[PDB]
């Protein structure tokens, strides 16, 4: 029991695709708009990329890039690389390693620091290090 | 145009001579408009056995609609063009 | 060498567009489904949002924002300030500042913990502050 | 003052909806592209699913997940509940708690850190936990 | 078909006895190509009253179109078709 519309108004297209309850309807109005609506689901595959643009503020997809970047703030979601950028603050995850550098790091709680270590510790400093009981 | 003679149309056949007939005028119709010439105006081609189709154009005192509908079982395509809306395509059942 | 289709039949349309090998293959089915193909490339630019929500969890870009939200979570890419939360547990990442805040805090390795720093360390605390070796 | 063409070329779809200045311009064009323009917005809603594919590189969402995902590296930001994997490296986000586990830890500054706790700090160790002045 | 004779249209009238009177044939036209058939090649069927309408097919020495168009007030349907750009489909005003 489907119906099937293809219009073209002053609004804009008005394609609608409904069956007796569910129903797939987009649209392409002329007020600068483009919606979509489903009811199960919206798949989109490609082969190479996936731009998503508001005058460089990207969100790409290679076949093994994820970069979720604007002017002087990314995530590169690599292959075994995970970088998080605010230059100059970096927090960069590796198979094995994580490493995070800035230039000043606040660090609060509320009840507990468990900083446990199944071999040695190697802390470094300057003039002080100072501590409260 | 190649819409040769269905059946069940009336013809006057005029007889010229012995064992010559001939076919001259058609008294019939499929498509008309049966309405009082103020609540429609019909400009349409049936076309097709069992007469599924239209090229139909009805001015109501309304609006225009340029039309090729088709009636099928559980099958109505159509390819709708108004003044007041635009250009459709549809399919229902 | 090309072809060009547009249906309406009961599944919907198919909309497919081929080269002699290539392609970009769009739906939208009658069951609900919308799916989209290619050989290349999709690209998509606005130029004020783009908002992708399945019953508020949202995708949303602006021309300075990229919000990766839900329900009790969010990552807030602004311009230079990154924001991750679960209420209540922040990591707020600045120009020249990274702060960490929680209530508790586990930090696990298996060699080695370097915490360098090229100007001196401020540790506070309360009742213990214990070690082993 | 709107324009609305349809058309089907060898190069493919061209779809514009133009008002006098405005518009939403959608192309699919033979060569493998789609393309999308707007100049207001684009909204796109479903109810199950969203997922983009390249060959292995997810962007999906559910009615609670989002996943960023491709081989080896994904962010579950599940509800209340915030993985990032690089296996074996992992950052857990809990309501009440922020876990760190990795195989090694580097954490450079240039002048502070500060380390505070509202109530004790439990720090374990192996053979070496050195410092300097 | 179902085109009835509309008014403001020419047409000889025999009279075949008395008070019998028929109507024979059509000296009249709406739709003329007035170029000098090397400019345009015109086939079309101009439809409905104010004749807001054209199922035309020009070719020129040029390209050839197939077109359904309508003129309204600020309102200009078309379904183009060429030999060298394709299938159109367009509302402007």
Do not use: W
Not at chain 1, 58 to 81: G, N
Request: hydrophobic share 35%; with cysteine.
């Amino acid at each position: 029991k489907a119906d099937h519309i293809f219009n073209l108004e002053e609004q804009g297209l008005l394609i609608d695709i409904k069956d007796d309850s569910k129903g797939c309807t987009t649209k392409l109005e002329s007020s600068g708009k483009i919606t979509h609506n489903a009811t199960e689901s919206i798949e989109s595959s490609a082969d190479k990329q996936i731009i998503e643009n508001v005058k460089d503020s990207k969100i790409s997809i290679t076949e093994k890039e994820i970069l979720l970047a604007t002017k002087k703030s990314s995530i590169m979601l690599s292959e075994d690389k995970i970088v998080i950028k605010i230059g100059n603050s970096l927090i960069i995850l590796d198979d094995s390693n994580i490493s995070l550098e800035s230039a000043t790091i606040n660090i609060k709680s509320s009840a507990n620091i468990n900083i446990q270590a199944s071999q040695n510790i190697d802390i470094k400093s300057l003039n002080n290090s100072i501590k409260a009981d | 145009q190649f819409i040769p003679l269905r059946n069940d149309d009336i013809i006057l056949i005029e007889i010229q001579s012995f064992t010559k007939g001939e076919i001259i005028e058609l008294i019939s119709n499929s498509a008309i408009s049966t309405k009082k010439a103020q609540q429609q105006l019909l400009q349409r081609q049936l076309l097709g056995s069992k007469e599924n189709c239209e090229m139909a154009y009805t001015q109501t005192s309304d609006s225009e609609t340029f039309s090729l509908t088709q009636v099928n079982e559980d099958c109505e395509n159509s390819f709708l063009i108004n003044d007041k809306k635009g250009i459709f395509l549809r399919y229902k059942s």
